[PDB]
Amino acid sequence: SSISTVDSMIALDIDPLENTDFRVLELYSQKELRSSNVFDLEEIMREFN
Amino acid sequence: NLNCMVTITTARSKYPYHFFATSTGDVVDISPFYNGTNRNASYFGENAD
Ligand SMILES: *[C@@H]1O[C@H](CO)[C@@H](O[C@@H]2O[C@H](CO)[C@@H](O[C@@H]3O[C@H](CO)[C@@H](O)[C@H](O)[C@@H]3O)[C@H](O)[C@H]2NC(C)=O)[C@H](O)[C@H]1NC(C)=O
Numbered sequence: 001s002s003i004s005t006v007d008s009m010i011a012l013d014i015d016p017l018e019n020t021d022f023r024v025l026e027l028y029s030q031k032e033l034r035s036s037n038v039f040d041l042e043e044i045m046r047e048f049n
Numbered sequence: 050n051l052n053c054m055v056t057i058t059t060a061r062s063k064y065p066y067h068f069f070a071t072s073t074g075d076v077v078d079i080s081p082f083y084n085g086t087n088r089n090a091s092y093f094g095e096n097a098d
């Protein structure tokens with residue numbers, strides 16, 4: 001018809017928590033961890049050989 | 050005084066297995082699986098003669 005309708009629905013729309021795909025963060029690569037040492041055992045053994 | 054010996058030790062190699070290393074520091078640049086017909090798929094860098 002042409003009659004207004006009372007809007008009495010108290011909206012409670014709680015948006016769901018969106019998914020998170022946690023990264024595997026890499027701070028120091030293997031090369032840096034191997035190069036962080038002054039004395040490399042492999043090089044010393046190669047020199048001795 | 051001349052004495053000949055036969056030492057039996059254990060050698061270790063890591064992937065990609067392009068060199069092994071006995072316990073006495075004998076660093077050998079030969080793949081422990083190079084059988085003489087798969088040089089294309091296994092390293093070999095020691096003296097050829
Ligand atoms: C030296 O080692 C190499 C590998 O580094 C050997 O080559 C491989 O030999 C195996 C065993 O014969 C082959 O497998 C065969 O393959 C076919 C399917 O293609 C099948 O008919 C057989 O049942 C068998 O599994 C393999 O293909 C071959 N190549 C590679 C790249 O792995 C070689 O034979 C060794 N040589 C000696 C003298 O021991």
Ligand SMILES: *[C@@H]1O[C@H](CO)[C@@H](O[C@@H]2O[C@H](CO)[C@@H](O)[C@H](O)[C@H]2NC(C)=O)[C@H](O)[C@H]1NC(C)=O
Nearest residue numbers: 065066067080085086087088089090091092093
């Ligand atoms: C020798 O080994 C190399 C790599 O170790 C092989 O080269 C590969 O060849 C395949 C097939 O042609 C390619 O899909 C790869 O991308 C290649 N890899 C590299 C790193 O080049 C070569 O085929 C081998 N030779 C043989 C088996 O005769």
